[PDB]
Symmetry: C4
Subunit: 180 residues, 4 copies
Amino acid sequence: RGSHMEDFVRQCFNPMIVELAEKAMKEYGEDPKIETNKFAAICTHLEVCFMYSDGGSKHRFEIIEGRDRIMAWTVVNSICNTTGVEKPKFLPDLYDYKENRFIDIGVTRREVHIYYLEKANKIKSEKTHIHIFSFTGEEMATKADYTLDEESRARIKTRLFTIRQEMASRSLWDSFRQSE
Amino acid sequence: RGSHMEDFVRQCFNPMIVELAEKAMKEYGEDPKIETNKFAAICTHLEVCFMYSDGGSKHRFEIIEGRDRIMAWTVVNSICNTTGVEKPKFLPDLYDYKENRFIDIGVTRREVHIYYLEKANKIKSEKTHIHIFSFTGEEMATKADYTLDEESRARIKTRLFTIRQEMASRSLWDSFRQSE
Amino acid sequence: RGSHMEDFVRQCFNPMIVELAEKAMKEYGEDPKIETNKFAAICTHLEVCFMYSDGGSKHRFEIIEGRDRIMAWTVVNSICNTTGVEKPKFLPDLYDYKENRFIDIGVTRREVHIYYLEKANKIKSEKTHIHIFSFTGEEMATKADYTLDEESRARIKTRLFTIRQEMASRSLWDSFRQSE
Amino acid sequence: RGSHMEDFVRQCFNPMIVELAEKAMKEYGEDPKIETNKFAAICTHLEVCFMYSDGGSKHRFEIIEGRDRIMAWTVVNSICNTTGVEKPKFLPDLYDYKENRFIDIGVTRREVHIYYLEKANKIKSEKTHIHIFSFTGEEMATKADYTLDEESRARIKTRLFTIRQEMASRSLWDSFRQSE
Ligand SMILES: O=C1c2c(O)c(=O)ccn2N([C@@H]2c3ccccc3SCc3c2ccc(F)c3F)[C@@H]2COCCN12
Ligand SMILES: O=C1c2c(O)c(=O)ccn2N([C@@H]2c3ccccc3SCc3c2ccc(F)c3F)[C@@H]2COCCN12
Ligand SMILES: O=C1c2c(O)c(=O)ccn2N([C@@H]2c3ccccc3SCc3c2ccc(F)c3F)[C@@H]2COCCN12
Ligand SMILES: O=C1c2c(O)c(=O)ccn2N([C@@H]2c3ccccc3SCc3c2ccc(F)c3F)[C@@H]2COCCN12
Ligand SMILES: [Mn+2]
Ligand SMILES: [Mn+2]
Ligand SMILES: [Mn+2]
Ligand SMILES: [Mn+2]
Ligand SMILES: [Mn+2]
Ligand SMILES: [Mn+2]
Ligand SMILES: [Mn+2]
Ligand SMILES: [Mn+2]
């Protein structure tokens, strides 16, 4: 079962990010060779999260993404027990030591408005800061507080649009978009 | 056809920069072993662009130079579609997320004034910021806005003059200058 | 004599930190394969000190920890003879060129209050700044002056709690805590 | 002719710095295996210069030291022709793009006062900034302008005193000091 999307993912993303995404899907029992749109989404979300955590000042963010589930919750636990924040119901993506809150990042193929609505009504962890990015350059953040300065977010949006174009160039964009 | 200028270029410039320049000429069908003055100019322009993008704050610049033409235009496209800037008629060298504009860098063996005139009247992309450097330490930037702080530009000018001297020391300077 | 704690230490800590801790115990004649709780404490203290010295601005701290005793005292001597600070009675962990004082860092399994009391009454080098961290997220610093900004200290506390959890997960936490 | 001082130098200094010092002595025809005190002085001066240039902000300094004589003068030439500073009579150690002046660094085994006098009366390049360091923690800079912030200079003085101690520990200090 060799998908053009699998080969595309492997050439489009850093090998470390492909490895971490494969390990994520295996931690949830999914298979990157079958759920290839999901493979691509997970790689994209990972790259966005790493770029995001690179946006801050040094030591600003604790990266929860890209860890195995047990260790991700371990670090969440330590953050909660040393800071006093409430433990989220669902796994966040980052923790912000500057603003002292968890960040749940999202990347959507649709209007950021409706994806943000879904996530907010899902988690309802309140304290957890939400930050949606779209493949068209839109973003949406809790309380209109976008955490990072403009240029760091602009980089992320540029990269998302480049991924979109690469997929389109290979005719994978349609199925990806109509898979979410 | 072994030129002293080819060997000089290979010893004067970083091997990565020589490789990227060779790939640029091949993308336009030119041959570094024949167009050796052009080889040297492309290597120089590349080093200047990389030093330039190093001048900013972290994440400040998107580097368009040193990519294949298709991918360079891809990244231009993403920048335009996420920021709303007008798409330049000709390929720029960088994008500035701080000031939100494309930078077309030039390096000339003549008066910066006349090279800047040529480029401005050529592209006339208006929004695109022009920044000329010369092999004698002069520079010229759109609206007298030089983007970078003094020291970062001084480094570039020093390196340009050192290249000029190295060429002169080997007696390549005259043909280079009278080739532009 | 193969301890679960020895294997745990070797998988929990960076190999460089394990090596430096082994060399420390050998410099004092102790054996990491027997004093395994002490092995773990020394590794932890080392990681905390390195994170601490990473918190500052560049060039801010001189690291005294992780050197052999002779060289540690050599660097203390040079600091004292170039700055004019009084030579501590006991080896400190860092020197702060910004605030111009030695830092003795401590990590305790008990109330930071009582460990700080013990160290202060022990060294009584006055000028030497004390900074206690606990495995529960508490800290205590001379004159309520915590040297580093909040986020750098938060990172350290998170890591301490993660170590605590890893030990607990393996059922080593109890003996560790009841060993201090 | 195997000197304890040669072996000491090779173990005390980074291998890159030993290599650059050997190349310096060869550029002036001297031999590190005979002029071993001079070998040590050149290595020390090199380490001080590199620490110095590390003190600044990024791009602040152009390093003239550690180049072959021809290329050192080449870079001096480029600095002079792009900035307009007067060309020093003797080779400086650094150039400061922030303050726009050449720095001649000195390291002395005697009172900084008398070494500074000697150098100032020697070069008399006026514009060239002088900065003396001593093996006892004293420094002396033109116009009481010490260029770098306190901590960066403190590091240098600490390292100088550590070198002094290492030499003393091996009984080389006396001959070194009575060689200058
Ligand atoms: O962290 C996430 C996660 C997000 O953070 C997210 O933003 C969107 C979606 N997520 N989910 C990610 C994920 C992440 C990125 C893109 C798509 C998916 S789709 C489901 C899935 C995920 C991981 C492995 C796997 F096999 C999956 F089927 C799961 C939800 O359980 C916690 C971890 N996690
Ligand atoms: O980006 C440039 C470019 C510049 O950015 C530039 O400043 C001057 C000149 N350029 N041109 C560069 C180039 C770049 C630097 C120095 C000389 C040349 S000379 C023509 C040429 C170039 C690349 C390959 C090649 F084979 C060429 F003949 C082309 C114009 O088409 C877009 C890419 N490009
Ligand atoms: O630097 C320290 C040191 C501290 O800095 C410290 O905070 C607590 C305790 N220390 N001691 C450390 C140490 C460091 C960290 C955790 C536990 C121990 S327990 C005794 C011991 C140490 C080193 C080797 C060894 F074999 C030991 F038995 C010794 C006191 O002699 C100066 C060096 N040193
Ligand atoms: O740059 C220096 C230099 C200094 O910058 C300096 O501060 C003191 C002394 N210098 N001199 C250095 C030197 C540098 C550091 C310590 C001792 C010496 S002692 C003579 C000597 C030097 C280099 C090679 C050699 F074989 C020598 F005999 C020569 C003076 O000619 C320009 C280069 N240079
Ligand atoms: Mn996640
Ligand atoms: Mn997410
Ligand atoms: Mn270009
Ligand atoms: Mn250009
Ligand atoms: Mn210690
Ligand atoms: Mn300590
Ligand atoms: Mn010199
Ligand atoms: Mn000097």
